[PDB]
């Protein structure tokens, strides 16, 4: 049994507390990067993070993209999305397959 | 060209490595082609799932934002972390062409005043939970697959442009070098025999 | 070891006009005669082709040239397949592979121990090549307007079998090979309308 | 010192001559230099260095340059070694013999055996090249009841950078180890450019340890070789593919081999590290690895030195 | 030049029954003694195997061939490790490379200047070799039950380290070597559960 | 037989000498065994194993040691063949000549060569090495209208195990095929370590077929050779892609190649199999394959033999 | 065959301090003079570096050090290009390849048949190499201000050609090479804004 | 012209020989075609292609075959250049010299060298292979004060 963590502002990711998810709120880059890194070291399974937080710390995210755990998944906030997560798909597609299937 | 001992022992050793490199070259391109064919199927559901999740999650969030606006702030703060339910994950390891792929499944172990509108937003997050899970499963599957495709492709390019040509050219240099020195020693032995 | 860099082979190729090099890779997989159709050559090929252009009064030299052109193109197409993958086939290019494969298997390969495939006269050699070439002709011409690649491959199952078995057709029954040739024309229109 | 054309074997030989003093004491080193068919600029480099360090009033030099007759190179090393054995075994001195280029000695010896039209050995060199070289290198060491000693540091360039060439080959079977300079290290700005893996010292096992050096000498040594060897192997996989795909442990090893070459090996030709500083430096490099990987060092040493 | 094709080596190999081939690649890593376990041989290994099997009353001849076979498969397996990633390998083949890694490092490597590891008696050799093989034979069991290779690697970092140190414990403490053996079976027993 | 130093080519030689026979009992079979440059221990091994099994009463041995004069080494094979040609072409016997080691013989040929101050020579060996091997190899076969025959199984070692060495290379130009011993196989425990893929017999087609062996001999041969080839191939796909990526048919082939090595070729140096035992064992391994994959063979043979 | 393992080449390299390794591949690519800047060496480089530091009273040693460093990094980078692709490289790594390209094509490559390019004075070598390095230092700085590698290339099309033709500038008009430096700065700082 | 076996250097040779001309004037250009150690078929191809196109009317041919003795094979290009030098320097013509095959020449030079018990150089070829080839090719060029020139195309 592994664990689940959530990163985002209060008004968006607060209800996730009702599931036992480790829900924290980082605003600075160093705060998010540290939390994610400690989540990985204490064996968290999945880390859902808003795109308004993931945009601040991209270097740390791609560091775990090649690892089995944790899985870092970009969810939107109430305001919406930055379109990063759906473009990171395209980033992985073109890196492997040269032409478009989408 | 590689830098190594121009010996008979090294020559015979390098030539067998060339044979190893050539078969492994194709073994990777069969590995790459069939790793990517499935990658197409996986990435299609990835885009289909994320675009689905990114909208159900948003509406449920804004609904919560709007609902909590009419309710007192202090009430919400204490309602949260009731919990009263604990949800965790159970990761199984599945193989897709020599690639570690995560198999995730949900594992388990609300105040009277939860407004109807609030409840609509609260179970709206509970309605989301199974779909967010396989988004995590598929994406990580695709991420761990794309890196493998990168590694395979990059290794293939290394095998074809760097490894084998250096190997062929070294097997040619040492082979000719041995052929030259033998001609030299034999020639020397000819003069000695006359003595 | 099959290395033609041998002093004997090298000095021989300086005076001989015809070269039949036998690949070891063709020796196994039982491709006989294992003469490599790319490395091998004939300094008589031009004149012979025009001599037979009179004995048969046909564009035999044009067929031989087209037969080779298909084979060289295959090698170019082969490395495209390796470095990149089987896609994109472009229909026409993947067809060239199938025609070349037909040439390699239904024409180039012949059993010297088979009682009718140990010898095929000019009469038979012509008809066999004409059938294979006209298959590629009629398929590429119907491909454009307008058919997809494995539609043809699905409707030409039995007719390519006849082409593959044209080798074993007795000399006194030479007309059967000619019958194969015009069966091809009707079967791709059979699915052109309607496909 | 096994070197090649272009590599700085001059500075390496000069440095160890300018810095070598034995512990437990404060004795001198009466060096004796033997130039063998080397260029003026190579010879002048040593003398211009010996004056500046004042080691010239402590030395005796035999100069045979490239303009000098080639046949004289046959007697030249025998002159210096005879002078060396004299100062050590008779005048009771601690002598340090430096001969270069030893490659030129063998080629001059080949000129005679070719002129005599003898039955040639490998590569045209005479069949007595090994024994002839052995009559030079074996004239070193200490003898009983005598305070004098002769330490020998010959220098040769490997033809075609080939270790299997008759001259570096036969020399390797004689001498008690070797120090090998490599172009791949030198171009990487590593000074001195010593590839420690093909290098060797045959008498390092009894001249080290407690009473000689610090007690953790042997353990750290073998552990460093094992770590650097797999370190090189890791980076070998790092240029063909991304660093993330390989094991993190391998990645630590890769970073280790980076630090080892740049910090440990690359000390510069004008740095004088005491045995205390070299050993503690290795522990900081061994620090990067978990204790599970340090299989060459006993646990008692691990709980005493490792951070 | 290290070339063993030279007459002295080749003529000797036709008149002797044992060949301890040393190569520089192992020597440079300070793998001592640097004997190539793949190109070396001994035509006494059969009869010696039976002898030391009798006086020990343990299937030593079966133990020594399974250890050599693992090393032989390791050579064929490394050929693709150089090509494809190490993690890409099968679980039951990654165990082979680790149990081969153990044979090379924990057993094959032996420093002559260590005063406990200078000499090793037949009984210490047996106990050491027994541990290495029984680990892989115990790990293959769990691996066939459904346990995953990585899960049984982290849970054995405590017992494998002790195997690495089994070289350095005195010949009055052979009971400490077999202490490790039953520990392995114990440890993987609640890892599988 | 092509072997190398360390490989069990002496156990193989000894095994052949005892088990070799003609299945017509109306033909006197004999074995001429020549030992060349052979060390005393393996020379004794042969002599004692030739007695313990009673193979001596059928055989003639020629023992030459390594420390014995190099002229004797050269003369030993010719001493063995002169006997072989008499027992066969004058006394009408089926003679099987076994010679080992041929590398030792060649070294003595080099020793006498430089004694006459002759000059090398491809890789050290004299320029007439080809004929000098032919002069004692080609002395074999069957003669018209003459009862009896001479058959040779010369065994040599490959220096550092490369077939480009003068001794194996030139021998292949005089003999029809070869039997290759592999160190990979031997290290894995396969006895005898005979690699079937690179080994060849050019004259096998004539010694088989009804009346000589069974009717299915050539069909089972081609099928085993092919199945093992694709069997070994499926294994190296399972190490790159894992067993999951392999099709169900290839997994069977992969398991085929494994058991083909551990049962079919791994006889043991003290396990004699008749031609019938061998053939039927081939069918047990062919039964491993799917029926849809057995359509290659004649259905006449499939019905009669499992 | 251009094989420098030849005894003559080997014997010579033992008694000389300067080695100008001519490369056949560069010759076929019309890179003249075909000198291998990776394999070639000069054991006078340290000494000459000091001398030119005091005859120009500049820091000539550091210029040729960074100049070589860029070239030596280019080799490392090029090996990556033929593995993953040039577009897999970051803006810093792609800038380095475009600076190194300039070093080769605008400085190293020297036509011996052009009336002005056949000879380059000591001071023109300074002004050219300074302009080249100046571009790299400014573009690198521009990237640190949020600018993209692509934007730098497009916006500096005019200047980068003026750099490419500095070797054709007469010795009498060396000031026309110095003024390039000002244009480089004024251009890239404008790109950062635009 | 650097070629290989099976390649059409034969046709390229004959083509140039019959198309070679200058924009100088009508008749001051000539061709000296030297065949070296080539097969008879290759020679008869040359000889008749010269006859057919009428290119023979302005050219001189030295045809040496592969079966002709080795020393006659090495003397062939020297007699070709001797004739060429005469026509160019004594008679003021622009002479184009076509020579093939140089590989046959080297093998002939190789055979003669070993017959004279000479020590061989790289890859079993004479040490003086450079100088020997140079004594042929350097025979080309223009001379001051002399009308005409010698141009070589060694195939």
Numbering used by the authors:
A (entry chain H): 2 to 103
B (entry chain G): 2 to 110, 121 to 206
C (entry chain A): 394 to 588
D (entry chain F): 149 to 455
E (entry chain C): 394 to 586
F (entry chain D): 149 to 454
G (entry chain B): 394 to 587
H (entry chain E): 149 to 303
What does the primary publication say about this deposited structure?
V-ATPases function as proton pumps in acidic organelles and plasma membranes of eukaryotic cells. Furthermore, E. hirae V-ATPase physiologically functions as an ion pump, similar to eukaryotic V-ATPases34353637, and is composed of nine subunits with amino acid sequences that are homologous to those of the corresponding subunits of eukaryotic V-ATPases638. Thus, the V1 motor achieves its rotational dynamics via several conformational changes that are generated by the binding of ATP, release of Pi and ADP, and cooperative coupling among these conformational changes.
